[PDB]
Point group: D2
């Protein structure tokens, strides 16, 4: 798993479950092309997005469908989605965790990059 997404709900103090997440990779022609997607699990995580072979260096975007999550809870949100845009770099072996901490009018995102 070179790429995992973890989403937390700062209002309820809980994993954010059933959050849609879409990953895109920037193509040679500079448009965003679909790469992987899924929905977060009960632990708030999305595993199995990609493989070491497929996850080559390049620019990626992770879009987290925050608005739909809040709407499901009846809470009026600010953002359409949370967007995380980064370059994958081969720099020796690496695993990327993209974490997001959600509130209705605020989010934080952190990258935890480790070497197994």
């Amino acid at each position: 798993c070179p790429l995992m997404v973890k989403v937390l709900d700062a209002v309820r103090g809980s994993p954010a479950i059933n959050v849609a997440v879409h990953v895109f990779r920037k193509a040679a022609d500079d448009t965003w092309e679909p790469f992987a997607s899924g929905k977060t699990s009960e632990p708030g995580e999305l595993h199995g997005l990609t493989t070491e072979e497929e996850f080559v260096e390049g620019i990626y975007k992770v879009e987290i469908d925050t608005k739909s999550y809040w709407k499901a809870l009846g809470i009026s949100p600010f953002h359409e989605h949370a967007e995380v845009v980064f370059t994958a770099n081969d720099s020796g072996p690496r695993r990327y965790t993209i974490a997001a901490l959600l509130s209705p009018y605020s989010y934080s995102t952190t990258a935890v990059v480790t070497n197994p």
Copy 2:
């Protein structure tokens, strides 16, 4: 001001100066049209992006060029930029402050929305 952006540096405990900011508005053909741009000042703020008249209802994207900010300080950060995407003015004119708090591998962004 109907739209202001404020950027803070969590490493230095200071406003983030000279950060480039680009604002886009989603067009009828679902493309991101350039709307406004500027750079943060010494207090870490960007004022004067738009006017109440020009700032109509729509979906806006505020792009904060965090990578260039970090690189100029000698840090190779994780993200390319911070993106903030939101519907504005859909229940009438509001004033929006988009704040961002920057660290090399993490950022948070908050919206403060007031009714004039």
Copy 3:
């Protein structure tokens, strides 16, 4: 002002009004002596806590009564309060802004430190 506190509500996207704040200073006998207190105003700010003369070097604690804030809105939050503990003025007078961004089960706090 040598010390200002600003508090934002991440649920509502608004300043956090009427939040009680208590400031302490560590005494020679290592107890926390009351230093100043107040409540945030409509812009979510608390000004006028102290003066450059009174705000000597020391270890200070800013206690933000977040629990009472949430409870008044109908939310049972996780934390009792937010505590911010720091050495101040040890390389001469500075101006400190202590910011806090509140959610029911999460908060962040940032310091912006400037030299007048």
Copy 4:
């Protein structure tokens, strides 16, 4: 494990390793008495602080020794420590994760409370 602590470094994008963490419980006489402590592991976590039997309802404080962590990295920090103060509540079965995301001049803390 009814109580776990997880600490992340927002500057390096990594778990925060070898961070001292002290837990206190508020005694009948209203003073803070030592309850548990340890240092974070390579994954940035501290497990095994307490047991279900010992972790009774009451007010707890988790102190995270952030200053020492930054100092070890040669980075000048703002806070003496990060302090998390909360009431443990029996509300059916519960597991508490106290997460902290560290920057030199800012931290966030989140409680993730789940039911196994």
